[PDB]
Design a protein around this ligand. Sequence first.
Ligand SMILES: Cc1ncc(C[n+]2c([C@@](C)(O)C(=O)O)sc(CCOP(=O)(O)OP(=O)(O)O)c2C)c(N)n1
Ligand SMILES: Cc1ncc(C[n+]2csc(CCOP(=O)(O)OP(=O)(O)O)c2C)c(N)n1
Ligand code: SF4
Ligand code: SF4
Ligand code: SF4
Ligand SMILES: [Mg+2]
Ligand SMILES: [Mg+2]
Lengths: 1164, 501, 167
Amino acid sequence: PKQTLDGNTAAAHVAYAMSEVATIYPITPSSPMAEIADEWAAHGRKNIFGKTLQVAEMQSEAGAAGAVHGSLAAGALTTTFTASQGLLLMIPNMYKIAGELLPCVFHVAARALSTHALSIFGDHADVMAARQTGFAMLSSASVQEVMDLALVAHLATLKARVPFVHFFDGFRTSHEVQKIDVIEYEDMAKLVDWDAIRAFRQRALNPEHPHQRGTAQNPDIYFQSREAANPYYLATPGIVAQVMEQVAGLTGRHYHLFDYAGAPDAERVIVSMGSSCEVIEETVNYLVEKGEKVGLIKVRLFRPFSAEHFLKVLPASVKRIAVLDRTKEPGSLGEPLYEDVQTVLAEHGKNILVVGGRYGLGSKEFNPSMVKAVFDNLAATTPKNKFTVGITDDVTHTSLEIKEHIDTSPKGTFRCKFFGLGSDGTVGANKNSIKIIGDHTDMYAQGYFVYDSKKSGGVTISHLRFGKQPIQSAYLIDQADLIACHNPSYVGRYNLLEGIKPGGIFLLNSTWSAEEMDSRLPADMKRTIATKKLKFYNIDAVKIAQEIGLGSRINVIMQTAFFKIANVIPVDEAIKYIKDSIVKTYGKKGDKILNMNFAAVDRALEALEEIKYPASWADAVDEAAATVTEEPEFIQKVLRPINALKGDELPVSTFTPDGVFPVGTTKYEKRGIAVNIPQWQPENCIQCNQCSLVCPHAAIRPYLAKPADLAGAPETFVTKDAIGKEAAGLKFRIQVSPLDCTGCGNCADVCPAKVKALTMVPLEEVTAVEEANYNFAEQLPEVKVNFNPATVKGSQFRQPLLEFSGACAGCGETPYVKLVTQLFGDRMIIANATGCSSIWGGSAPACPYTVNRQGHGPAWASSLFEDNAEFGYGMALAVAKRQDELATAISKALEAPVSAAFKAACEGWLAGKDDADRSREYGDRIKALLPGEISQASGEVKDLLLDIDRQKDYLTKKSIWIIGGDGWAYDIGYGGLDHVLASGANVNVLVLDTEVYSNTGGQSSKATQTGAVARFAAGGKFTKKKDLGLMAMSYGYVYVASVAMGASHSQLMKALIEAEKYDGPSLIIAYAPCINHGINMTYSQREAKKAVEAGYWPLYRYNPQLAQEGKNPFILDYKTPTASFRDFLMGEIRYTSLKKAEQLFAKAEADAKARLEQYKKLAE
Amino acid sequence: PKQTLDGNTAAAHVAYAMSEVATIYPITPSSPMAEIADEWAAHGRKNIFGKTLQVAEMQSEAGAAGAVHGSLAAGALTTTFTASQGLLLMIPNMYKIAGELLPCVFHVAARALSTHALSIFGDHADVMAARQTGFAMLSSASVQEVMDLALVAHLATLKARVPFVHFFDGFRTSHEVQKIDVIEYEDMAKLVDWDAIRAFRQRALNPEHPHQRGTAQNPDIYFQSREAANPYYLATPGIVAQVMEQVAGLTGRHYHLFDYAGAPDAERVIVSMGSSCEVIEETVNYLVEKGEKVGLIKVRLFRPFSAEHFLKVLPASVKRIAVLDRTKEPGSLGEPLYEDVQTVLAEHGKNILVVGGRYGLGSKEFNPSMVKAVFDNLAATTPKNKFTVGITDDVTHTSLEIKEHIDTSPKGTFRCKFFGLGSDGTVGANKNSIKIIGDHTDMYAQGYFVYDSKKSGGVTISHLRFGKQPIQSAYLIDQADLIACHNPSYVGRYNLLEGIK
Amino acid sequence: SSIWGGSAPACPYTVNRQGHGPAWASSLFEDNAEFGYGMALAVAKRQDELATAISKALEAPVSAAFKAACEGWLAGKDDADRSREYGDRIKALLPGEISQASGEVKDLLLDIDRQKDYLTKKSIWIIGGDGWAYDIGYGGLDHVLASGANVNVLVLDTEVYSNTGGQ
Ligand SMILES: Cc1ncc(C[n+]2c([C@@](C)(O)C(=O)O)sc(CCOP(=O)(O)OP(=O)(O)O)c2C)c(N)n1
Ligand SMILES: Cc1ncc(C[n+]2csc(CCOP(=O)(O)OP(=O)(O)O)c2C)c(N)n1
Ligand code: SF4
Ligand code: SF4
Ligand code: SF4
Ligand SMILES: [Mg+2]
Ligand SMILES: [Mg+2]
């Protein structure tokens, strides 16, 4: 049958049918494969064995790989899905699985490896890192090929006994939606070699016919034993070839080990692999028809590399070959595929000039214009070798010049771009539009979706294609017949109408009339509309949704507007298909919700009005650009073009060679995405600063100023007298940053005044006023104040060093990290695990960590997902070594003829170098005496002072903070965290416990509670939550504390300060509410208060220092809960969606009572 | 000075001098490096920074690799020692360390990977599994070369900012005892680019001049950012070449990225790497004196592979080349070194018949009789390609036939075999005899020891050599001048007098 | 435990008088807990295929003594003693039951006989040293314990890395 799927679903479809067990672990962009396999098993989909697939989630891909190995050796057909860093961790087991000749298929959504930077996007770096393990390797070039070649892999591995890696390009194919022919399970079972399966069962570990495998071997037999598998690898090419003929007879689609396309007498041929083959064949069709003698060899079976099957499809007329590798091996002579082609042609004496290049790293665009550039390089007198395509390499001059732009799209193919807002329904509607068109017409349909790094308020760009011919355009849309803008704020911000065809359609969602078009639309946009004679349509979708009662949801409205003008299908047919999908989507919502969406369709058709623009729009002239402010060179050359969606134009000379970025760059973004912003009521404010404490974006802060410093304040900068003996004679004001606020509403909810001192007002109404207000508050001079930093009020007067990050509105993680920077950020180094905290904390080119007025601030680094604890441990060793080198130079200065005041500060530092306050005090004293002491010295004594000055950045004692999520701490990095805590080093571990893998969409974890439903746990998690805090207490010398900011501000303050001062390992497990819980983020602080009050989350502190004082180390800070446990679960969707459901809710309540009663015994 | 050491001690000697931190985790046969580095720190040996090396043991080599990254990024020169399954667990962090251009040297006693079976013995499977991480790769063929090239790696990585894997063959060199010239720490400090060290400190993570590293990047900038390190890899070959000249002027021993030995008009040449280069050169000396036009190219800097330095030492008279790889990549068209040689010669239009083979997997014996078989295959009318040497492959017919047995040991070299019992003192005594002879004579001394898998009561066979010429015989004793049997039970049980002259 | 337990060419694990005995496998140093976990999942999968073929035999024209042992095994397939008792009854009645059957009934009995090596409930044993359990494999050992699977982990604590020399 025909369905609209992506590569992931296409792969999981075949993997599910052919497997009994699937051990999985989430990693983008492979996790959708494991998610859908869990849902199918949850609803009882049967594989070819008549049973449901058993899905088991491990603690890491290393654990997943071992489970695959054991399951295979014991007699169960087992598969798994992974990519990128996950595939690296499976490499050790891959040698074993291949070495033991076990049938197996790994499905890989090929993704780049973390080098100078992390990239979740697609290339072959991961697959190439395992090409020597002995696995076979099969490449799929399209979503249709994923369906077919996944079947080829599963059938071939049973026959050959050689395990397979079936890989397809991450995102470019794994997330591309296409209408394909789906192969029925019943047809798969008719092709399976059942004799091969039964032989596999007989080789299983079984005590009734036992055997020994995996022995240790001496040099006398190891080499021979390793070569004994030679026949199995020699027979694999023919086995795969015969399987491809089986699939060919069933589907009609013919695959070979290497496939050729292009002129039979071609002289220039490109050898490539993966989705690039689709782009190359489309270009080859275009060039061959124009008379060029070019061709393409698609590599399907990369390993084992069959020389016979490669030469079989190479035309005898080939004189020059360009090999394209989607990877980079630095310092290597050439990339993998290039060296293979060069080798095989040498082994057979072919006089063919071979040239290799690199493309598409990290989902870099690879379009037909680049393909011609590769072909033109083969047509040159001396073809450039070791080249790159798709970048401008102005440093080493490896890039090919893209001279001209060609349009190789098949005639009759419709192309549309949709600019949407984060979670406004645009992407979901386009997926439904593809499903509508694919199911009811003969046209092929394709969809690809570009997402934003910002988690809330980001830009989404949808790329859709429909045509009478199969769609091989695995690249972004170049010339669009229709461009739709579902957010009017994008007008004048992004190049929306880029590349639109003459006479194309421009659909806009805005409240602007035809006359307001002259003043609202920019001149460059008006020129394109007029010169290209576009059909410009406008619709006020927001007005329609308000009047009907759908709020601001415009997804149904904008989809109706598309079909009305696109002329892809009859307008009357589309309306039926839209309303039919509404019944499928809103049928269970009720009669009221159903008819509202029906009215949305009807009202949208009548409201879509074509804008009749004057022809004089073609001559419009840009308006004079204002005098731009002097911004740093990085902001001007890097951050602005990247946020302007022009980062691909930046040449190689723009970037550092090691991925090092400046700090404090998010303050230049000023996204202004808030719908409402807090307005401060000075008369109701008690000056408690709790609003600044809970802000997940540091958008609201308190400001103090002497009355003289309030001179040039705007009239709206109303201040109040400062409360407290510390701030006597000063003015106070709570000021919000309107362009950086997210409109989450946490600060208004936490305000404890009798009358609310914060009220949510629309941004547009007060944006002009509050911007000048914030610009004045930010320019206020520093005020020396003696407020105790150990209190909530006093700590918020210190500058936040984490601001304006990309976390969601109301995130429960950033308030914890923001508070740490306010206490110790002056002297801390952060080792941050991969996860949400690394995405909002370190997504290029914007850095949310900033500096104070002295230029000091946290240094931030992210290594890997699994190594963060050991990463920070290594930092502690190095910092200790750097202080030791400084202490030696200071002790040498004591014997030098230096000033008596210099010797006093040196001795004071040497005695207190391991104390935070004393080392800063005497450290700053030495800094003040350094310039004068150097001037008064000469010769070797001056050199000794210059060495101290070179190391003055290590006088102040540092504070190592190891930050990461619960998935890192409870699963993949738990072994390393256990080791670093047990070592006794002076490190501080902060676990942001969201009880799921939050960044990757919300998958199951050991931090997930009993009965909670998450991805990979569709039926709910049976086993209870692992108690990480209890295991760290078992050492006795590890400080462990469980905190929750929403529950108790004072309890969080005490545990953080006690943990940092403790000269040893400290573990802070913080409850972080998240969007994956299925709750209203406006009341994110309130949800954490209900969690502790209902006995769901405990609050305790284990202080090893109390044991040395003869006291009880365990202190239970909240003993008696006052709220109902069952009522808290019903306030989050992650528990209500389960409603077998009642049995799990009862087990969760029994575990919460036993956990509280166990803490009462440890406290008594 | 001259001391009797093994490859492990020779490497740890240099690693200790040039490093401040060493995060370690045990794995045969690399753990002796971390053991002896731990003992030196306990007795207060000073490095070139005047302090003792800080040794930290982790929960695994993956934890060790992560600790290296953190220590380097925080401003301390850090090293580690690993092999085989341990190096695999370090592969993820190697991408980060190489990607961030951090100076570093991993010392690896190259050991086979666990496939159909575990093997603690030596081959290049582990090092080849990381050849795409972006680390440089430097191969030493003897105990003396371990001393010298470990210094080359530590000096080169500071200058190039490209991290190095300095690897030597497990057991065959890591546990081979030889009398070598030991390089003084004071002489090492006279060659260090101290400007490079201070610059490395300035890039460290520090809150007083903060920065962000290890970001996540979208498709708009990732490709460009990955190619921005191209100058650093292009400059690494010349940096290594110049560093080798620094060591050359100090020690008198001349290393190059690729070294040539054999007839200047040779027509058959073997390209190889590791301890096989010693065995091949010894055989080449024997064949060249017999009139055969044969030669040998030793690969020192495997990555980055400099085509210019490789073609520089390849005689124009070469017609046929046999490449020997000490690894197996099942299903691959050819093994790594074979594909590099095949590629570079194709890129330069050389009409040279190239043939690749596999040898010495899991410390399989590789002796001169096998080397001649490789040369004889190049002399055949149709040379067999994709071959094996040292085994009898009667299934797929890849093995070369060992036609005749030759003795290529330099004349005047004494050779002794000692058959001992487990822990009866024989091995320790032979080691002491080597130290006695090495410290008090002008003779070179070599010791290699075959152990048993049984922990108590096993058979041990010691192979010792002494001669007036340097001992390149990285293979078991073929013709012994003396054979000693320290256990009468072996009489009638084992072929003790096998091969005695 | 893998060197004295599985160094080629000698295997110390042997079989009993009936030819049954422990099947031995070693994967890697770090993955042993998850290794045995995967085996437990597979054996459970292999028992389900046999149990389904036995339930089909209840509805087939076979002898009453054959059906009596099948119902007894299906009720006690997860008990060590009961599954062996009724399992051996099935094995003893199989050759005669196959002789008295034909067609699809004979094929259904031949499928029971093909899987009779899964009648007796298996005992998965995860054996390793203190280095595996306390260090490199602790994360995997922690996970398999949390899963609740019916596995038996035996940690031979020598308080050192005995094989590699005593680290
Ligand atoms: C070894 C390994 N395995 C899996 C991953 C994928 N991966 C992540 C990314 C950022 O790399 C990604 O989304 O691509 S983030 C992530 C889970 C994060 O879970 P945590 O609970 O630790 O942090 P939070 O995101 O705050 O919930 C995973 C599994 C990874 N990066 N490395
Ligand atoms: C991944 C990996 N790292 C290191 C090694 C080397 N190695 C083999 S056994 C062993 C330690 C065994 O210690 P233990 O778990 O206590 O078992 P024991 O020998 O003491 O019985 C090590 C480090 C290895 N084989 N694999
Ligand atoms: S509404 Fe949310 S983002 Fe805006 S200032 Fe308040 S807490 Fe911060
Ligand atoms: S929470 Fe309310 S009372 Fe407290 S400082 Fe903020 S606005 Fe003022
Ligand atoms: S933790 Fe949850 S709320 Fe915070 S950024 Fe991640 S997904 Fe968004
Ligand atoms: Mg989490
Ligand atoms: Mg032990």
